[PDB]
Amino acid sequence: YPDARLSSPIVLDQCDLVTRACGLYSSYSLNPQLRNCKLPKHIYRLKYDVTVTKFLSDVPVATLPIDFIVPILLKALSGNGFCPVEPRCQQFLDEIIKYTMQDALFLKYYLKNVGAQEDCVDDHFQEKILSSIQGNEFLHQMFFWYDLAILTRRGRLNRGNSRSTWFVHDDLIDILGYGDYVFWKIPISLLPLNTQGIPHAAMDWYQTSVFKEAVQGHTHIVSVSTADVLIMCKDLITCRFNTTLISKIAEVEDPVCSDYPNFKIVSMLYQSGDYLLSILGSDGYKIIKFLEPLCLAKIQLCSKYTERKGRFLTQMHLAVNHTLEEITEIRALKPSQAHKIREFHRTLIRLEMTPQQLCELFSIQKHWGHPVLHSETAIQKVKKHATVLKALRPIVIFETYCVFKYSIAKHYFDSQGSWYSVTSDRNLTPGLNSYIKRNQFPPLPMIKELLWEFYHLDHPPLFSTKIISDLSIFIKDRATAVERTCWDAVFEPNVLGYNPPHKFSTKRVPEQFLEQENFSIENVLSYAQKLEYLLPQYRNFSFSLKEKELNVGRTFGKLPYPTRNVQTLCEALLADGLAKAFPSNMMVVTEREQKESLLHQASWHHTSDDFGEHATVRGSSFVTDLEKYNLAFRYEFTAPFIEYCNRCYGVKNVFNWMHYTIPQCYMHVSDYYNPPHNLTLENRNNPPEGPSSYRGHMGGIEGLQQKLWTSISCAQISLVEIKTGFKLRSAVMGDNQCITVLSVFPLETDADEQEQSAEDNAARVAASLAKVTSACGIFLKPDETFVHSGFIYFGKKQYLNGVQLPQSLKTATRMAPLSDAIFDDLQGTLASIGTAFERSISETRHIFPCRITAAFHTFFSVRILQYHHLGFNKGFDLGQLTLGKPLDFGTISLALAVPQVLGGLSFLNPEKCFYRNLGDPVTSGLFQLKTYLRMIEMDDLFLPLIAKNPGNCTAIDFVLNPSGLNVPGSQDLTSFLRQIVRRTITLSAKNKLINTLFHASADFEDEMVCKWLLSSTPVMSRFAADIFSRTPSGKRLQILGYLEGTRTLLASKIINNNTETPVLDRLRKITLQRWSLWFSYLDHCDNILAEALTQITCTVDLAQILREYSWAHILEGRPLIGATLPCMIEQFKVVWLKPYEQCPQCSNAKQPGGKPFVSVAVKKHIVSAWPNASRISWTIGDGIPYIGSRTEDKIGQPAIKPKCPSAALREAIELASRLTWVTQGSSNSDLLIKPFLEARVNLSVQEILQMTPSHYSGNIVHRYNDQYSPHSFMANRMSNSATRLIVSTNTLGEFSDSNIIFQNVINYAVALFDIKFRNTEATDIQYNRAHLHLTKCCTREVPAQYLTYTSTLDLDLTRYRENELIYDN
Amino acid sequence: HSFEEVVQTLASLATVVQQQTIASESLEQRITSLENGLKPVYDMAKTISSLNRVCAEMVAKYDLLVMTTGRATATAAATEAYWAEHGQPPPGPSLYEESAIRGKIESRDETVPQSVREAFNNLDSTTSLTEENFGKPDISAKDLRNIMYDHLPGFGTAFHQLVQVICKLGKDSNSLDIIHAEFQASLAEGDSPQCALIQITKRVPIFQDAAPPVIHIRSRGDIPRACQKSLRPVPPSPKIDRGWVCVFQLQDGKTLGLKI
Amino acid sequence: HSFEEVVQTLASLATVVQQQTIASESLEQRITSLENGLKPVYDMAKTISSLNRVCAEMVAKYDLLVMTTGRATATAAATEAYWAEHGQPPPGPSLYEES
Amino acid sequence: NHSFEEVVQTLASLATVVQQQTIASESLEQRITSLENGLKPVYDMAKTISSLNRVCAEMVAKYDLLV
Amino acid sequence: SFEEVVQTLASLATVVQQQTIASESLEQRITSLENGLKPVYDMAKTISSLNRVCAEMVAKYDLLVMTT
Ligand SMILES: [Zn+2]
């Protein structure tokens, strides 16, 4: 099952064989063996293909590389010729535009109804949008490339029949697709000419005289590639169209100035990059790689100038000039070409843009493609500096080790008591024994002379080889490395030249984990502790090339299965045991931070709460790269740390598995079509090393042991902080580390030399850190490490002097009709588009471009899936076999407006513009549907559109989906995959531990326990869902779900051995049934619910009635509580007061009780603003973003504090706490805990009751609402306006307990204020404060109710006396 | 008789009691001599704490050193002998001192292995690092010429000649850093590159009252086409800072210059 | 009563003579303890300062030390660890560097 | 007269013996107090010297199997 | 006369017995100084061993690092 997007690196080694079968010439591969190797059974019959022979009957024997021709095709290809696809993708274009225009509608109507709208109203809005969509440069090319992608996917699916050959002729270009391969026939006149008279692409393989007799009297030439450059080009075209459309639309909202760069500058950048690539080949990506650092440097210069602020731009300019000079000396460019080639970076340097525009332009980096990777250069890059002799200073290593131990001791002391009962001689620590006697940890300022004493401290094994609570980490559908016995079987046995004596049976993880007869954690500990990874059959460590990237070559390693298990075990142990003494994620912005707390934390010379006040703190920062550390690690530096990690646990030789086995392996890249050089059958057991192999790998490997390396880096930073008396903060994210230095000033130092002093302090800290790191054997780059004062970029967020910069083209440009969503499911594609739109609108400040793009892509995806589906036969029509009549625009328009919760296909809810976490997904959907039906004069369809027919759902998905509806159209394909996995487990479960967990009566026991969990009065689904995850049923459920793609379903031999019926037919049947479920209408609805839902005129009542009618079999008569919440859009109303105005609602004498409301006011302090204060989104304020209305009262303290617990102990404690807290009106609670607790721990009841805290709260519904925080709300607006507003809720009085989520009120108010004023001058705002008055129609008083249980489980859970996530001794 | 015997016995008892007193005095004298002599032992008790501190610190340091160094280390004589077999640093870590190996590097007489040389040079290159010159770029004539070229639109313009003249004069006078800093400051202010170059010519003290360079050409074909419109007769006393950028000498003796 | 007085006086004289001998023996023991106790004190007190000085100079010279790595630490450590428990050499073929 | 002189001499001898015994007891108490004062610091110093001695011995033993 | 002589003899005998008891107790207390002095002997014998092992460590230091 071929995929619709790029998921593999681009390697063209096998094409060398294809051109050999057609009598052509092409030197793609650097391995001479492919020059004279036997051709496979396939790609050899091309001599007998009539179409291929006719295609290549008028072209020269010599060919050209595809590296130099991609930019030519990206411009010379447009949709004008004849294409074999009968329904053209451009035929259904007008309907797409109509649907898109229907969203400058109700979206705007929704905003006006809410009260947001916009002060400036322009009549010319529809025609401008229509012209912007119609007048796009990349419009028809996108449709043509999608047609090409559909055709090539259909051809690739068969690859064994006569239908795998397709032909396209478009003006100047000819394309012939055949079974994973594409032949391009292009005119010669389009290629740039070298000064010797030959094309630039032909000088790599041919001499000047050689490439003049091969062409002779010919006008067209042929290039050969795989069926993966086409998908890359399609993605490129789609991304370019998306960004151009977004930039063009953004100009309509704000003509004065927008946050997107332009739609004409980006076109010039695209053309310049394409020309540079066409001239310089795949080697030209070293200049495209500079778009990001140059943008960062330009952003850095958008503030106050400093003598060292321009060093970044100067260094980047020097680097790009040197790179451009170096790779062009050998090439013989014409004097005219050498001037045009210097237009990419020349344009980038001379840019004059606001910081927001540059931040948005930062995102367009992979819009030119990706290079071609070779297995030789990729390994030459890593070999050259992974076997390099180093020089080290022992004193720095000793100090780093001492700081490591000190940090571990401090973390242990800070939590759960004090100290750890050192079992060492007191005379060997003269100066630390007194602190232990007084039971006080030494303060930081005076830890410089007792550092060495920390070497002498001894302690028991603080941590435990326990506390793993996820089996999904041991089965993750990844690939491993074959054993040493059969290591050359992964190569194709025709390029190799011999048949390998040994052949492996499997390569995947999930079908190897199930066959592990002797599993369990202690087995892995025994395997690692006995040095069993040094056995002769466990040393392979294959390589694999990295995904889409612009680097020359990157790789990740693969180990045999038991060593992978050991690696996963070590990572899991280090994740929560260690790596907690060294907090990695420490995102802090000193600008928007309170003065008193910052000054308290920034006082190095003690006196955190006793130092004199009135001392401003200014912070600086610098950024380093942590990835490059991986290969620079040596055993002589990391041995003491690994030994200490071993000693802190009960292990002996576990954490040093890597350094003991990596040098003993034979390093190579496991690629199918190029084995290592000079490999024969004779030298099989002792193969020689060549350009793509080596033996003594002394360094590290990325991803392996990352936590330990991060901890060592943090220890080094702490050592630097100790050496020089400065306050240091460290943050790590991805391959970046940000170090922040706090200065502290005694005031009376204005703001001119203050920043200079802060920058100098940062520079000296960076110099000291570089010295220490170089002494440890890792070399930083002084010409690449840069010091910033207020501009901090890190991971997912970048700030400029406390002002957040928008970054929305990262996600908005990835929208596409086609995505890998399990058998091309429509629901998955629509959900992906919706979540991409939500994530994009979470950033930036424009609303319409992203939603217009999403609306454009939704209808296109629907049409493509309807007409061209890969899962069915050619010529099929999904819209005719279900309805029986042609499917029209009205049906799609009506079906795309019903929310997915009620059974529709609407994922673009406008309410997401205010907040991302909804209190109730049913009431909001009902409100959206009612508003949409009210806009159109077709309101008489609400009742016969939400009733529908309840489905046959057992009492296992209600627990899984607490706030949901029992309809068959709102379900996804998860249950199908879970059932398939369960059957596969049942057929083959020789693991001997999974079999015990998955016994004969597992399903019926799960059904009984879920039925009992919902047999209370009243029934609460949220509590049942929260409590169900700690039972063995939850473990079985989490083990069951591991299928993620539609390639394991069909290509796995273990799954497909069930015989019975093929999975493909079941998939087709379920797809047809699901398609019939939608677009049908008035065929799956009843009448009893429709008449029972009349004259309700209340969304909360409608939702409650719908929930009650559904799950009728589960709930006979027992009421359901704690699931229904109101929609806040329908709850509050705004008045939008102005300075000298009074609220009419508040001015009606407030007769009966009064008029509760929420007040929003705007501040006047600006603090900082970049570039100006014209827009509120460019400014910040005093700060605060609220604190909390006393949160809640917390009670309960455990009688005894446990030591390092186990995995099941915490789960049992939480079980006991929840069961005790939920039910309190009866004494039967002790009879309910025992059946659950007896399957988790050996302890008995009344012995854990003192371990659990005496939790006692009120309402219990509110505790599960926000106090437990099932999903913390956040917001979908940039955190800029929220710092310039004051929100008062105390004026509500008696608070309408309450049925109001107070966290969402602040988000609603802030988002409404931001959306109301987003394209207007700050000084032109005519409104001072806002009143949010609540309506007495969706607010209710919830009483305090508890849970009662009549019966008990009466199940025997004692049978679970085995290992893993279940009962332990 | 009896009285005399009693008197004699009493005298003997008195003498023996006197001897007892003498013996007790001697015993007390010995005890007090012991007490007086035991004082230095009490006084030397304070010197043990510093000894314990230093010895424990040394033990910890060298214990960590032997822990981090493998069983295969090879003594100094072993490394010296094995250096006679190609470069080939011996297997297993080796110990040096900074001064010894530093002094050995220059003395190219005992064939120090190359890899050791690059390793030590890389390690020692970071010592000369301070708050200044940490990430300070270096500037040459060609690099500055290219940087200034990339900001000027067009080709063959007299501004290119002005840039070349400025670069040559800065290379001669060793003042490129000041020129680059002033150019960057002018660009950051908001001026055009032409205005920045004019400010460089006017402001830098070196360019004040300097004779424009003379370039020998034979006819109009040498000078670019963009410079065709900027030919003026040479004044008797031309000034480089007055707007004049260069002076061209013709084959027949004619002298012409360019002005902005 | 003369005989009883003579016997009592003789017994008293014998007891006082025994006490004199005991006191003399105790004095001799005290003198011997004085002579033996302080004889080694001077030498050890002198050596304390020398040992402190040599430890201090060793600590001072520890800082000016540079170590160069080699491609034999991993295999040697693995061999030692494999010999520590079930003290049989690791199975063939031979590791990277053997020496 | 002789009997009175003998009684006086015996009383004086008894008084001298009592005074000598008291002086001996005082010297014994002084010696005991001196021993009590001196017992502890020498014990602590001996313990420290033994600890450092064994630690240095084991470190040098670890260094031994390297040459 | 005889009674006075008997009383004086009894007093002398009691005083002699008390003196002998006191002398025996003093000798017993004196004979306990060996336990106090033994740690001094132990320190004297261990200081030489510490010096020897430190000298061995210093001598072994020069065997590894080449110095000048
Ligand atoms: Zn009001």
Side-chain angles (χ1 to χ4, degrees), chain A residues 811-1021 1023-1057 1059 1061-1092:
Chain A
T811 65
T813 57
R814 289 305 291 178
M815 293 175 206
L818 281 180
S819 55
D820 304 320
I822 306 280
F823 205 59
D824 281 338
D825 202 45
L826 184 49
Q827 216 185 24
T829 302
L830 295 202
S832 59
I833 289 178
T835 191
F837 154 74
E838 183 178 1
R839 282 212 257 277
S840 293
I841 193 66
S842 164
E843 317 276 334
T844 191
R845 78 156 149 94
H846 302 300
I847 293 184
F848 274 93
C850 303
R851 189 168 177 92
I852 278 172
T853 311
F856 186 95
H857 285 297
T858 292
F859 209 102
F860 195 20
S861 75
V862 159
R863 279 294 186 209
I864 297 169
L865 263 189
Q866 182 212 342
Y867 274 123
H868 311 97
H869 202 301
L870 199 76
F872 293 85
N873 266 348
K874 198 176 181 292
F876 213 79
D877 196 335
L878 275 165
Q880 184 94 42
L881 277 296
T882 68
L883 274 77
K885 47 159 173 297
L887 200 150
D888 63 358
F889 171 79
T891 306
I892 297 169
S893 188
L894 196 57
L896 283 179
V898 185
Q900 182 260 344
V901 180
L902 319 180
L905 287 171
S906 181
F907 293 88
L908 309 158
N909 188 17
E911 195 170 339
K912 302 289 186 176
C913 294
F914 305 90
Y915 35 84
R916 64 195 302 109
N917 286 113
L918 303 192
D920 205 337
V922 171
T923 52
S924 58
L926 288 172
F927 184 73
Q928 176 213 344
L929 190 46
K930 174 176 274 197
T931 314
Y932 175 79
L933 286 179
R934 199 219 306 151
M935 182 179 72
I936 302 169
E937 290 84 35
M938 185 180 288
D939 205 1
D940 63 358
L941 294 174
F942 191 40
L943 277 297
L945 198 56
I946 64 167
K948 295 211 159 45
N949 277 344
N952 297 278
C953 184
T954 61
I956 193 66
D957 310 321
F958 191 25
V959 174
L960 269 160
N961 290 318
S963 58
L965 258 60
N966 179 24
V967 289
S970 76
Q971 311 298 321
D972 63 358
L973 265 65
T974 305
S975 58
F976 198 63
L977 304 185
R978 280 208 295 257
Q979 183 254 329
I980 292 179
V981 170
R982 173 59 171 119
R983 179 65 65 192
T984 307
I985 280 183
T986 300
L987 294 174
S988 293
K990 50 186 289 192
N991 187 265
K992 205 174 153 293
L993 272 297
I994 290 308
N995 258 328
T996 297
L997 190 61
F998 285 93
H999 39 72
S1001 84
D1003 291 331
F1004 168 53
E1005 183 178 1
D1006 293 332
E1007 176 76 19
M1008 293 182 286
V1009 66
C1010 283
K1011 281 272 199 155
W1012 179 85
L1013 264 179
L1014 298 162
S1015 55
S1016 302
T1017 299
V1019 184
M1020 191 195 312
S1021 45
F1023 159 67
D1026 190 22
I1027 193 66
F1028 173 79
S1029 77
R1030 287 84 187 264
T1031 67
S1033 297
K1035 314 305 179 186
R1036 281 192 292 264
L1037 183 63
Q1038 90 178 3
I1039 284 179
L1040 269 181
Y1042 82 96
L1043 271 183
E1044 94 281 12
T1046 186
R1047 200 209 280 280
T1048 303
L1049 272 175
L1050 317 177
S1052 177
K1053 78 198 217 163
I1054 190 167
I1055 288 189
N1056 293 49
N1057 278 344
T1059 72
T1061 176
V1063 69
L1064 206 52
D1065 291 331
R1066 301 147 74 181
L1067 278 169
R1068 289 189 205 193
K1069 290 189 315 214
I1070 199 182
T1071 300
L1072 270 172
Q1073 177 156 0
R1074 286 166 69 77
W1075 262 81
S1076 181
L1077 268 175
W1078 305 291
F1079 309 121
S1080 277
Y1081 182 50
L1082 61 83
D1083 287 329
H1084 304 76
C1085 70
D1086 50 3
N1087 206 77
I1088 193 66
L1089 200 48
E1091 63 87 20

Side-chain angles (χ1 to χ4, degrees), chain A residues 1135 1137 1142-1147 1155-1158 1330-1333:
Chain A
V1135 183
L1137 303 178
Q1142 287 69 240
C1143 178
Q1145 312 259 326
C1146 291
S1147 77
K1155 309 300 282 293
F1157 66 95
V1158 181
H1331 271 203
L1332 270 76
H1333 287 266

Side-chain angles (χ1 to χ4, degrees), chain A residues 586-588 598 601 717 721 727-731 738-742:
Chain A
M586 293 177 70
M587 185 64 72
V588 64
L598 191 68
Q601 85 204 39
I717 295 175
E721 162 186 348
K727 190 71 199 309
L728 278 299
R729 315 273 317 247
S730 172
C738 187
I739 294 92
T740 301
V741 192
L742 278 80

Side-chain angles (χ1 to χ4, degrees), chain A residues 225-236:
Chain A
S225 72
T226 60
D228 281 296
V229 189
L230 197 147
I231 313 286
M232 180 186 71
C233 295
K234 183 259 288 180
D235 300 359
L236 261 59

Side-chain angles (χ1 to χ4, degrees), chain A residues 788-803:
Chain A
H788 328 297
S789 300
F791 175 57
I792 62 170
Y793 54 88
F794 198 69
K796 68 181 178 67
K797 276 185 180 181
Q798 323 163 315
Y799 296 85
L800 176 70
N801 275 305
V803 167

